[PDB]
Structures are given as structure tokens and as C-alpha cells.
């Protein structure tokens, strides 16, 4: 679910940041590891803010998707773990949730009756004008994919049911351990990274 909007892409692949003075040494080091994980695999670079008007700020307060412009934007951190921060950074860079891709019905079923009332909006498709997948296949392993029971109203009730592949296996969804091969390949296309 890559943003289609040029204005939301960070110019030059550079994302200035500030980390709040309230975070511990451990939390700061973790934010830097999550930033570095995106950098190592793409042409995005995170730099300490100097004078930029628009930048991300880590605050103990999901993130805005892409560059809002005209000012700072929060990356608002029990959600205090590396993979959660890599997911939020995916929002910063320009990705919506994978299951909201305009083509998602070919890949998952949303079980609306199992969603906590008032949370159904989290499962709507993005309008086709707002996402350009860049030719990339739907990615069940994306760091941006919800788990099977996100916003579920109860124990064992799924809100997302992935389609079986030709081997009859429903792919696992919702990992928060590392960028998938598809997240990397798609971010490289989005930022027009050199080969
Ligand atoms: Zn999110
Ligand atoms: Zn994707």
C-alpha cells in the first residue's frame, strides 16, 4: 500500500528527525536501530534535524503516512519494541497498511462481524487514486500487514483471513521482526533508488 502521492515522498530520500530528551539510552538506541534497518536496505537516510521545517519527532505519546509538510510530525511510541518502530517508520516513509491495498480482496477476506464495533474503518480499502503498488505483488510478510486478529472482538475470532496458496497454505500475517523482501523491493521503487 505505497502512497501514490509525490508530495508525500520525502525529497531526496532524506528524513530529518529529533528524538525527545525523555527517552532512555536504551529506547534511543532502539529507535536508531529501527532507522538503520530501513537505511541499510534502501536509499532512505535519516539525519538529525538542523533547521528543517518538516521532520519526524519521536514522542512517548499509527503514524501519519509520508511527509505531511509545513511542520513536524510525530512518530508516537507496551509498544516499545524494534519491530513496532520499524512498522511506524514504514508509515513515515510512505506506506499504508498492506491489507488496505486496492487489490486486497484477491488475497484476504475481511471478517467484518468479528471487528470491534467502531474499528471497522481500519479495514477499508484505500481509494485507487491513493495507492500505487508499483507493480509489486500483495505481500503477506510485510511489516505493514495486520495480524489475523487485529481489532478482534474476541479470543480466537479472526478479522483477516488470508487466501490459500496453490499448496493450500494460508500465509502467516502480522510479523513484527524485520522488513520483508517485498517491503525492501517496494521501498526501493518508491524512492527511485539506484540499482
Ligand atoms: Zn500501522
Ligand atoms: Zn507492500
Swiss-Prot record:
Give disulfide pairs as residue numbers. Answer: 43-193
Instruction: List all annotated glycosylation positions.
Output: 22
**Localization of this protein:** Secreted
> Domain named Peptidase M12A: which ranges?
1-194
Identify the residues that bind Zn(2+). Answer: 87, 91, 97
Active site as annotated: 88
What disease association does UniProt give?
Answer: Atrial septal defect 6: A congenital heart malformation characterized by incomplete closure of the wall between the atria resulting in blood flow from the left to the right atria.
Q: What does this protein do?
A: Protease which processes procollagen C-propeptides, such as chordin, pro-biglycan and pro-lysyl oxidase. Required for the embryonic development. Predominant protease, which in the development, influences dorsal-ventral patterning and skeletogenesis.
Protein name in UniProt = Tolloid-like protein 1
Q: What is the phylogenetic placement of the source species in the record?
A: Eukaryota, Metazoa, Chordata, Craniata, Vertebrata
Of the parent protein, the shown chain spans 148 to 348 of 1013
Amino acid at each position: 500500500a505505497a502512497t501514490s502521492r509525490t508530495e508525500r515522498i520525502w525529497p531526496g530520500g532524506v528524513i530529518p528527525y529529533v528524538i525527545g530528551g525523555n527517552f532512555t539510552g536504551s529506547q534511543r538506541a532502539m529507535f536508531k536501530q529501527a532507522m538503520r534497518h530501513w537505511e541499510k536496505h534502501t536509499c532512505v537516510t535519516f539525519i538529525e534535524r538542523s533547521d528543517e521545517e518538516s521532520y519526524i519527532v519521536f514522542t512517548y505519546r499509527c503514524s501519519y503516512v509520508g511527509r505531511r509538510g509545513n511542520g513536524p510530525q510525530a512518530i508516537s511510541i507496551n509498544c516499545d519494541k524494534f519491530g513496532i518502530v520499524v512498522h511506524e517508520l514504514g508509515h513515515v516513509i510512505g506506506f499504508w497498511h498492506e491489507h488496505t491495498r486496492p487489490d486486497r480482496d484477491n488475497h484476504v477476506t475481511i471478517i467484518r462481524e468479528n471487528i470491534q464495533p467502531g474499528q471497522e474503518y481500519n479495514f477499508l480499502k484505500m481509494e485507487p487514486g491513493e495507492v500505487n503498488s508499483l507493480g509489486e505483488r500483495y505481500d503477506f510478510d510485510s511489516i505493514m500487514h495486520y495480524a489475523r486478529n487485529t481489532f478482534s472482538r474476541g479470543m480466537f475470532l479472526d478479522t483477516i483471513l488470508p487466501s490459500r496458496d496453490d499448496n493450500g497454505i494460508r500465509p502467516a500475517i502480522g510479523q513484527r521482526t524485520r522488513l520483508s523482501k517485498g517491503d525492501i523491493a517496494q521501498a526501493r521503487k518508491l524512492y527511485r533508488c539506484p540499482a
